[PDB]
Amino acid sequence: GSSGSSGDAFTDQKIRQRYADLPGELHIIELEKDKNGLGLSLAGNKDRSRMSIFVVGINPEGPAAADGRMRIGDELLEINNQILYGRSHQNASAIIKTAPSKVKLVFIRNEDAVNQMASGPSSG
In which domain, by residue range, is 82 found? 7-118
Instruction: Give the strand order in the sheet containing 102-109.
Output: 25-32, 102-109, 78-79
Residue 71 forms part of a structural domain:
yes
Instruction: Please name the amino acid found at residue 123.
Output: S
Residues in the chain after which the chain is broken, C→N over 2.5 Å: none
Structure determined by: NMR
Give kind and range of the element (H or E) at residue 63. helix 63-67
Residue type, 102: K
**124 domain residue, yes or no:** no
Q: How far apart are CA 22 and CA 2, in angstroms?
A: 37
Which domain CATH number covers 52?
A: 2.30.42.10
Q: Look at residue 2 and tell me if it is in a domain.
A: no
Examine residue 97 and state whether it is found in any structural domain, yes or no: yes
The domain total for the chain is 1
Residue 114: inside a domain: yes
Q: Return phi, psi of residue 18, to 5°.
A: -70, -40
Q: What is the DSSP string of 64-123?
A: HHHHT---TT-EE-EESS-B-TTS-HHHHHHHHHHS-SEEEEEEEE-TTHHHHB------
